[PDB]
Design an enzyme around this catalytic site. Sequence first.
Site, mmCIF file in Angstrom:
data_model
loop_
_atom_site.group_PDB
_atom_site.id
_atom_site.type_symbol
_atom_site.label_atom_id
_atom_site.label_comp_id
_atom_site.label_asym_id
_atom_site.label_seq_id
_atom_site.Cartn_x
_atom_site.Cartn_y
_atom_site.Cartn_z
ATOM 1 N N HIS A 61 0.893 -1.191 0.000
ATOM 2 C CA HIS A 61 0.000 0.000 0.000
ATOM 3 C C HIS A 61 0.909 1.211 0.000
ATOM 4 O O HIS A 61 0.577 2.133 -0.833
ATOM 5 C CB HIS A 61 -0.924 -0.083 1.231
ATOM 6 C CG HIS A 61 -1.797 -1.318 1.150
ATOM 7 N ND1 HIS A 61 -1.851 -2.321 2.096
ATOM 8 C CD2 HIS A 61 -2.708 -1.658 0.225
ATOM 9 C CE1 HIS A 61 -2.760 -3.225 1.742
ATOM 10 N NE2 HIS A 61 -3.310 -2.813 0.603
ATOM 11 N N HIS A 91 4.596 6.774 7.674
ATOM 12 C CA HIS A 91 4.428 6.402 6.290
ATOM 13 C C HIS A 91 3.890 7.603 5.558
ATOM 14 O O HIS A 91 3.509 8.607 6.160
ATOM 15 C CB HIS A 91 3.459 5.244 6.130
ATOM 16 C CG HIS A 91 2.104 5.537 6.672
ATOM 17 N ND1 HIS A 91 1.671 5.319 7.943
ATOM 18 C CD2 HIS A 91 1.053 6.065 6.035
ATOM 19 C CE1 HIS A 91 0.419 5.793 8.078
ATOM 20 N NE2 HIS A 91 0.056 6.218 6.903
ATOM 21 N N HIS A 93 1.549 9.139 1.923
ATOM 22 C CA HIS A 93 0.615 8.983 0.834
ATOM 23 C C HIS A 93 1.036 9.981 -0.250
ATOM 24 O O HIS A 93 1.460 11.100 0.069
ATOM 25 C CB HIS A 93 -0.840 9.296 1.265
ATOM 26 C CG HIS A 93 -1.281 8.462 2.418
ATOM 27 N ND1 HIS A 93 -1.961 7.298 2.260
ATOM 28 C CD2 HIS A 93 -1.081 8.578 3.737
ATOM 29 C CE1 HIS A 93 -2.201 6.746 3.426
ATOM 30 N NE2 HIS A 93 -1.667 7.494 4.332
ATOM 31 N N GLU A 103 -3.977 13.417 1.622
ATOM 32 C CA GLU A 103 -5.274 12.889 2.116
ATOM 33 C C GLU A 103 -6.102 14.047 2.656
ATOM 34 O O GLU A 103 -7.183 14.362 2.138
ATOM 35 C CB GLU A 103 -5.021 11.794 3.132
ATOM 36 C CG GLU A 103 -4.401 10.556 2.480
ATOM 37 C CD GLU A 103 -4.608 9.296 3.191
ATOM 38 O OE1 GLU A 103 -4.396 9.281 4.424
ATOM 39 O OE2 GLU A 103 -4.983 8.307 2.531
ATOM 40 N N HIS A 116 2.423 10.768 7.668
ATOM 41 C CA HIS A 116 1.716 10.452 8.879
ATOM 42 C C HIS A 116 2.686 9.811 9.868
ATOM 43 O O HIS A 116 3.251 8.748 9.590
ATOM 44 C CB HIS A 116 0.588 9.438 8.585
ATOM 45 C CG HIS A 116 -0.521 10.029 7.835
ATOM 46 N ND1 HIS A 116 -1.514 9.270 7.198
ATOM 47 C CD2 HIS A 116 -0.787 11.345 7.609
ATOM 48 C CE1 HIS A 116 -2.301 10.116 6.627
ATOM 49 N NE2 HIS A 116 -1.925 11.352 6.823
ATOM 50 N N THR A 195 -6.914 6.120 7.985
ATOM 51 C CA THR A 195 -7.287 6.398 6.602
ATOM 52 C C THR A 195 -7.154 5.202 5.673
ATOM 53 O O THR A 195 -7.431 5.317 4.484
ATOM 54 C CB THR A 195 -6.532 7.587 6.013
ATOM 55 O OG1 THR A 195 -5.166 7.235 5.866
ATOM 56 C CG2 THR A 195 -6.753 8.859 6.795
#
Length: 257
Positions: A61, A91, A93, A103, A116, A195
């Site tokens: 992911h 991590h 996004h 996000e 995050h 999330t």
Amino acid sequence: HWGYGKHNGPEHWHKDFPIAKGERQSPVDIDTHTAKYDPSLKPLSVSYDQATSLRILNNGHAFNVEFDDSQDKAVLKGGPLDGTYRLIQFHFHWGSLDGQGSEHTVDKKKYAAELHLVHWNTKYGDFGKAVQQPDGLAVLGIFLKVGSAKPGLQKVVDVLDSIKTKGKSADFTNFDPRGLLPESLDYWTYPGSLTTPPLLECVTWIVLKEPISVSSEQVLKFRKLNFNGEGEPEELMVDNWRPAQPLKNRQIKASFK
């Protein structure tokens, strides 16, 4: 299983995780005009001097930088928080292009990426117990914009070639997360969720106002990662963000005027 595609992405998650349609889902759009300044909020205390990173992992992911959370070594306190929260992982996004990837959004603006830093409330003893509680986690969210390189990110970028595909990990010791923070700790805060599935409604979000800058070359290396495992058809790890969810009955508070 879940992902970010057309057939398994965010609009599908509610079928296996019905809380996806819950009352306190994340991320959200931060409307800066309606977030109210709360003079009762404290400065955030970020104490990362003794953090002990161990490993970086491609989980299919994103990639996770993992910490030793077996002592109070890297803790978040203050701000909106009661008690002490221990760093377990960070991590990111990110997008396929620099105009998307975050996000949270700010007045509908999407940043190129979002970091995050995940922390769990020590009063619940372990992460797995913490995520079952409405005040179990505190996540520090930091926006990334593309501009100047972030020197403190380069060690992460460096190692990504060794974790290209899902299930690969590598030793990642002695990495100092302080080099990922912006200058100011001004923030917005609201109650929300993880999330990614299982989307548990256990997070106090602390979203920093000031983005960090990373270079285009740094981001481009994130976009060479793969969601697939070794020897499977290549699908670039991009656009691993959940879009903004309904605010419902929540208030976003600002730490600053």
